[PDB]
Description:
Blueprint: H1 18-33, H2 37-52, H3 71-83, H4 87-94, H5 96-106, H6 112-120, H7 126-130, H8 138-145, H9 147-150, E1 154-155, H10 156-173, E2 178-181, H11 183-186, E3 191-192, E4 195-200, H12 210-220, E5 224-230, E6 235-245, E7 248-258, H13 264-272, H14 275-289, E8 292-293, E9 298-300, E10 305-306, H15 312-318
Parallel strand pairs: 4-7
Antiparallel strand pairs: 1-3, 2-4, 5-6, 6-7, 8-9, 9-10
Bound molecules: 2'-deoxyadenosine 5'-triphosphate (DTP) and magnesium ion (MG).
PDB class: transferase
Keywords: DNA Polymerase Mu, DNA break repair, Transferase-dNTP complex, transferase
Assembly: monomeric
Amino acid sequence: WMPAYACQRPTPLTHHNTGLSEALEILAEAAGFEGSEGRLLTFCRAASVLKALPSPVTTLSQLQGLPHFGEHSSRVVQELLEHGVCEEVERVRRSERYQTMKLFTQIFGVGVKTADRWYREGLRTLDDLREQPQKLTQQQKAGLQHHQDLSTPVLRSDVDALQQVVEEAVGQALPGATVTLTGGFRRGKLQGHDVDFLITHPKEGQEAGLLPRVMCRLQDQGLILYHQHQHSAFERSFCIFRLPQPGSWKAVRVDLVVAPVSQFPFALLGWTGSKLFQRELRRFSRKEKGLWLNSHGLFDPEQKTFFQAASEEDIFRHLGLEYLPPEQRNA
Length: 331
Ligand SMILES: Nc1ncnc2c1ncn2[C@H]1C[C@H](O)[C@@H](COP(=O)(O)OP(=O)(O)OP(=O)(O)O)O1
Ligand SMILES: [Mg+2]
């Protein structure tokens, strides 16, 4: 027996069922592109179960006793085991709708709704978007300008270099302020699509006005290609950095998030992911414990109270869950 909720079981970075999970995740992604959110979650959950298994699935008999494995996900796995390929998955892969929605949604600042609108309007390629600049936000224009670099996996070596410049800028702007790497890299991932940093200071309020200072410093070093600062709920800067490399440079997406230290454990938990892990953790919190969890806090709607947490461990404990380090949150 394996627990139902992804937040009740360790999911490591590397596993034994990558072919099967990849296929189910194609179907999940395609469902999301069609606005079929239930079906997305269902396929995502099934793929997550395979990631938590200790052995490869070689025969269909191994599916027995697993949660979140309905008829459809089972058929997909069955066809892959018996025939090496799943016709439904291959049809999705080859479909113009899926290919175009994947193309568009990958671009910085483009979500499903925008990509679907563009599809419906007859846009198909990146050049089509460039021919219609009035249809694009500034953020999307920047994503198109740098699209090749932004669809090149970000590497741990890139992350280490970026963390150094961000730490230097933060330290120079405000001694005592800290930078914490979050997102998939904190979970042990070797690559990613962006780099996520959470900034705070141990004295509540000393973080005020820090981010614009940090950004000024980075911009003056030539390290910023694009920056969008927003006060709202955490203060954040959505950026594209110009990462110098030997004889070259590459654009890399970086999100900088400032949280007041009182909210830091909630922010770190939220921003560390995985996306499915946090969805599951919030569902667990609400359904099993009656508490509402988000990136700012843990609220009891009956008592109208907020839980004081010093750490992620505090939050897990309060929810009655065994602690999972970030590298076991790869749901
Ligand atoms: N839709 C969402 N639901 C819940 N949490 C989310 C969602 N989107 C983002 N988050 C949280 C969890 C993520 O780990 C974190 C950073 O997002 P993001 O950088 O897109 O993912 P990631 O860093 O884990 O993977 P990647 O390797 O693609 O960067 O923010
Ligand atoms: Mg990330």
